[PDB]
Design a protein around this ligand. Structure first.
Ligand SMILES: *C(=O)[C@@H](NC(=O)Cc1ccccc1)[C@@H]1N[C@@H](C(=O)O)C(C)(C)S1
Ligand SMILES: CC1(C)S[C@@H]2[C@H](NC(=O)Cc3ccccc3)C(=O)N2[C@H]1C(=O)O
Ligand SMILES: CC1(C)S[C@@H]2[C@H](NC(=O)Cc3ccccc3)C(=O)N2[C@H]1C(=O)O
Length: 256
């Protein structure tokens, strides 16, 4: 598998990061898994989960109404733009952020939490010393090579995604909500999911940025085996490189 991933990376003209955790036995498949990559919109999982954590101690939080103003709109707001002049609840914002990658929704989550550094503190509270959120959307997607802002490593994000969706991080109702959200993602068809058997159940969150940065983080439920957690991060040397969902599908196929 390592030679395959190396050849994929070489042909691709970029930098590939993979971390697979097989929860059957905690074995792992790692490729540049301790290297930093810009998370892009995969960071939205952490923001949504931070709000879910708060909701463990505030039974009214998810139904809290948030005003959506025309000035809130940014580059991509497929759900929030339907609600300008109206409200969305925090749950609706979590769903939009995760399932459509609505950037206004992400920003509402960040603002509710008190800014990017609060998302980082939430990651720390889960045992993730690697994640950092520095900016709002869409500037968190600049993905400049070597820029530490808005980065994590494939292994750190695989570990934390496992903890969030299958493990210790959230109380049960909140864990289940996060899983429901990820399973209902609409943006990932061509990424990790395209490299897997069609009937495996998947929850995932994609991201795309400059430098052709193309990411997906997934929890995978095979029909007859324990879950897998897979992070596929990819980035390229040139700022206007095309995004490459297909590389993520290829990586997923290789490691499964
Ligand atoms: C998160 O990664 C967001 N990315 C951007 O807003 C920048 C961008 C990059 C390329 C094309 C359009 C916008 C959102 N998440 C990604 C994703 O999930 O792949 C989108 C392309 C849906 S925008
Ligand atoms: C890659 C694109 C075809 S899309 C990206 C950007 N558009 C947006 O940020 C809005 C948008 C976001 C998500 C989905 C659709 C549109 C924008 O413009 N971009 C294009 C480009 O660089 O050629
Ligand atoms: C269609 C748009 C509203 S979105 C597109 C572009 N915005 C981006 O490309 C977002 C982005 C920011 C940072 C890193 C990557 C992508 C930008 O600006 N764009 C618009 C446009 O042409 O009017």
């Amino acid at each position: 598998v390592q030679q395959q991933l190396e050849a994929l990376e070489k042909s691709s003209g970029g930098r590939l990061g993979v971390a697979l955790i097989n929860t059957a036995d905690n074995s792992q498949i790692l490729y540049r898994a301790d290297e930093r990559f810009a998370m892009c919109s995969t960071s939205k999982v952490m923001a949504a989960a931070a709000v879910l954590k708060q909701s463990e101690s505030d039974k009214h939080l998810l139904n809290q109404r948030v005003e959506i103003k025309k000035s809130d709109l940014v580059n991509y707001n497929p759900i929030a733009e339907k609600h300008v002049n109206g409200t969305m609840t925090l749950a609706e914002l979590g769903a939009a952020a995760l399932q459509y990658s609505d950037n206004t929704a992400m920003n509402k989550l960040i603002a509710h939490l008190g800014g990017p550094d609060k998302v980082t503190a939430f990651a720390r509270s889960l045992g993730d010393e690697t994640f950092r959120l520095d900016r709002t959307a869409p500037t968190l997607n600049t993905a400049i090579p070597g820029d530490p802002r808005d980065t994590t490593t494939p292994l750190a994000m695989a570990q934390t995604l496992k903890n969030l969706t299958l493990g210790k991080a959230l109380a049960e109702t909140q864990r289940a909500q996060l899983v429901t959200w990820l399973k209902g993602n609409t943006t990932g068809s061509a990424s990790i999911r395209a490299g897997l058997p069609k009937s495996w159940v998947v929850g995932d969150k994609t991201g795309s940025g400059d430098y052709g940065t193309t990411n997906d983080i997934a929890v995978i439920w095979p029909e007859n085996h324990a879950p897998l957690v897979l992070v596929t991060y990819f980035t390229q040397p040139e700022q206007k490189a095309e995004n490459r969902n297909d590389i993520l599908a290829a990586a997923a196929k290789i490691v499964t």
